[PDB]
């Protein structure tokens, strides 16, 4: 670590999480594809508050839904916004992405392709879990602190 910062167990940890490669697959609990046709009202209860809350200051009826885990989330210093805006900045305009906020009790990401839908999705689901880099450097896997 940089000269004037070698006793900071706190910075060590920061740099650790900024090096240790982290994919979406390392933070995801499970993924599901639903038939949820009305981009306004949802067939999923828990997601009502999230589609509402996204109207303050094209899309296929098929929904890819990921459930993320807080432990791994806050552990690897990651924000719902970071994760989401990273996925978004990956699939061009070729994908509609929305996500619950850091306050909600459930971390969720919803995605719609933007007809062979069901198929492209299971492929996109794959690219997301393995290829997208949320944080870290390629190839660097474990990363440990020692004194």
């Amino acid at each position: 670590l940089e000269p004037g910062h070698a006793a900071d167990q706190e910075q060590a940890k920061l740099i650790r999480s900024a090096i240790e490669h982290t994919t979406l697959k390392s933070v995801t609990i499970a993924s599901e594809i639903y038939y949820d046709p009305d981009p306004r009202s949802t067939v999923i209860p828990e997601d009502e508050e999230i589609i509402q809350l996204h109207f303050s200051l094209q899309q296929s009826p098929w929904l890819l839904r990921l459930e993320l885990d807080r432990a791994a989330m806050n552990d690897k210093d990651l924000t719902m916004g970071q994760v989401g805006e990273r996925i978004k900045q990956t699939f061009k305009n070729d994908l509609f992405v929305i996500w619950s906020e850091d306050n909600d009790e459930k971390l969720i990401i919803r995605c719609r392709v933007v007809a062979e839908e069901d198929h492209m999705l299971k492929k996109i689901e794959n690219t997301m879990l393995e290829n997208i880099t949320l944080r870290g450097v390629e190839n660097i896997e474990r990363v440990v602190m020692m004194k």
Partner: protein, 122 residues
């Protein structure tokens, strides 16, 4: 938990299809012309972190298995002290070392996981 169905006539796998007018989910057959409405909207599920498999092996004769360990704890149901117990039957590296017990009187499955998160253990 996507429990899927088969055709009524030709008994083949059904595939999800969209009724674009009333916006609902169907399941057609690609052999005959059969087609039905969907039970739930869930069409696919992928559990990166799973639980199923942990209890595999709980059989009626499990008590007669001599290689299994025995304890005398109490089961949350019949308080009978006749138990047989094993660790997670999944074979993943990232598993815990929690124990699963089987009441040999009422065959109830309980656990030593103080963070017990599930209700059925299946």
């Amino acid at each position: 938990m996507t429990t899927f169905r088969f055709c009524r006539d030709c008994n083949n796998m059904l595939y999800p299809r969209e009724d674009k007018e009333n916006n609902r989910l169907l399941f057609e057959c690609r052999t005959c012309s059969y087609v039905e409405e969907a039970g739930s909207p869930l069409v696919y599920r992928h559990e990166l972190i799973t639980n199923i498999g942990e209890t595999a092996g709980v059989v009626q004769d499990i008590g007669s298995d001599p290689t299994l360990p025995r304890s005398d704890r109490e089961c949350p149901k019949c308080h009978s002290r006749e138990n047989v117990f094993f660790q997670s039957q999944q074979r993943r590296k990232d598993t815990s070392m929690v124990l699963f017990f089987v009441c040999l009187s009422c065959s109830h499955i309980f656990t030593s996981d103080q963070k017990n998160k599930r209700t059925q253990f299946s």
